[PDB]
Amino acid sequence: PLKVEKFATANRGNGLRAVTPLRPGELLFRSDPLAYTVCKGSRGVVCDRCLLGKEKLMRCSQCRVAKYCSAKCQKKAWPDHKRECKCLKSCKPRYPPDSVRLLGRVVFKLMDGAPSESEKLYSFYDLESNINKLTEDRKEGLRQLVMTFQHFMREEIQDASQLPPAFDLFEAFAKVICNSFTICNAEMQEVGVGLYPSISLLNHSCDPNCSIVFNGPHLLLRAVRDIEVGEELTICYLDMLMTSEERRKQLRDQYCFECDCFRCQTQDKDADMLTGDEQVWKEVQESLKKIEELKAHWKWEQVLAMCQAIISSNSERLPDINIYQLKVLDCAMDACINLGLLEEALFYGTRTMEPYRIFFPGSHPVRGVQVMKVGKLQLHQGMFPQAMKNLRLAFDIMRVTHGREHSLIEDLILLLEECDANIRAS
Ligand SMILES: C[S@+](CC[C@H](N)C(=O)[O-])C[C@H]1O[C@@H](n2cnc3c(N)ncnc32)[C@H](O)[C@@H]1O
Ligand SMILES: N#Cc1cccc(O)c1
Ligand SMILES: [Zn+2]
Ligand SMILES: [Zn+2]
Ligand SMILES: [Zn+2]
C-alpha cells in the first residue's frame, strides 16, 4: 500500500501528494534508476555499476571506457552495457556528453528490458518536456544533442524501428533536461546521473517537505516534515547555497518555471549569503568554477592549493557565512579528508558548522553528512565529548534524511557506539 499518489496540480503539472499523514523520516518510495551512468569527472574513478570508489578499477576490455570495482560489478553491468559498449568503442577517442550516454541507456532499457519498477507511478513516456516553453537557444542545443546521439549510437540504432514506438529524440532530450537526477555518493560527492521517472513526479520547493538521498544508484525518498493527507510532496531541486537570483536563473534555464514561494518573494537569506566585500566574493565565485571542476575530477591536491590561497589569503577575506567562502571551506575540508590531512580538515569543517546550521534548516542530508564528517574527525583525534555531541546531531538529522535503509546510518551507529564506549571508559 503506497503512502503517495500521483495527481494533477492546479498550476505545476502533475505532482505527488500524501495518501496518509506522514512524519519526518518516513520512507515514502524507493527506486533503482530506469537508466544511469557515471558522470564525466568520476568516469574511471568510481565503479560504473555501483558508483563506489576503489584504488584500482578493472576496465571493459572491449570498449575500455566502462570501469568496475569487481568482477561481480563488471559481469552484472554487462546486460545494460552490452549495446553501448559497441558504440563507445566505435567512437573510441570521442566521449559523448553525459546526457547522450544516459539516453542511450534509456533506449536500450525500453527496447530490451522488462517494464521497470522505476516507472511504477510515472514513465519516461509521461515525463514533462516543457517543449512549449523552450527558448530558441535551448532548442538549438537540443538539436545538437540529437545529432550527437545519432552519431554515437549509429552502430546500434539506425532507424526508428530500433527506438520505442513514436519515440522522438528531440522530445526525449527535452525530458532529460528537466528530469535528470544527480547521483551523489555517501560523502555527497556527485558521481552520476540517472532517470527515476516515478520520483520525477515531485515538484520543487525552496523549502521542501521531502528529501531524496542516494545509496549507490538506489534512491530513497523520505518525508522531512509532518505532512497532511492530500498535501503536495516537494523536494528542493537545487543546492541550498544559492541566492534567490541564482535559483531563478537555474529554475528558468533548466526547468522552465518561475518560483512564487515565500523564500523567493522575500529574498530569504540572500543578504546574509552575500556578506563581505563584493569584489572579493566575486573573485572567489569566479575561482570556484575551476575549484569545482577540479573537485568533480577528484583532483584533491589541486583543490586544496586553490582553496588555501583563498582561506589563508594575504589579501582581503570573507566571512564564513558568505556562500562562496563556505563552498571553498567545504571543498578544502573534503580535499583534506581525502588527502589524510585530518587536523586541517577539522579546522575547515568546524568553521562550516554554524553556516550549515543556518542554510540547511530542519533535516537536510547535506548537513547531516557534514556534521557526521566533523564528528568523525573529532572522534579520531580523541575529542570524545565534542565528537559525541556532533555524532548525535548527525544521527538526529540522518535518522530523518537517510534512515535505516541507508547503509551510511549503520556506519554512523558504529561511530556512536565507539565514541560512547570511549566516554564510558573513564
Ligand atoms: C517533470 S518534473 C516535476 C513533475 C511535473 N510537474 C510533471 O508534470 O511531470 C519538473 C517540472 O515540473 C514543473 N515544476 C516543478 N516544480 C514547480 C514549481 N514549484 N512551480 C511550477 N512548476 C514546477 C516544471 O515544469 C518543471 O520543469
Ligand atoms: N559531442 C558533442 C556535443 C553535442 C552537443 C553539445 C555539446 O556540448 C557537445
Ligand atoms: Zn562496483
Ligand atoms: Zn565495454
Ligand atoms: Zn522559491
Residue numbers in the entry: 3 to 428
Task: Provide excerpts from the study.
The drug target in this study is the epigenetic regulator SET (suppressor of variegation, enhancer of zeste, trithorax) and MYND (myeloid-Nervy-DEAF1) domain-containing protein 3 (SMYD3). This belongs to the SMYD family which consists of five proteins (SMYD1 to SMYD5) that have similar structures and domain compositions. The SMYD family plays an intrinsic role in both normal and diseased states, with overexpression of SMYD2 found in cancerous tumours specifically oesophageal, bladder, and stomach whilst SMYD3 overexpression is detected in liver, colon, and breast carcinomas.
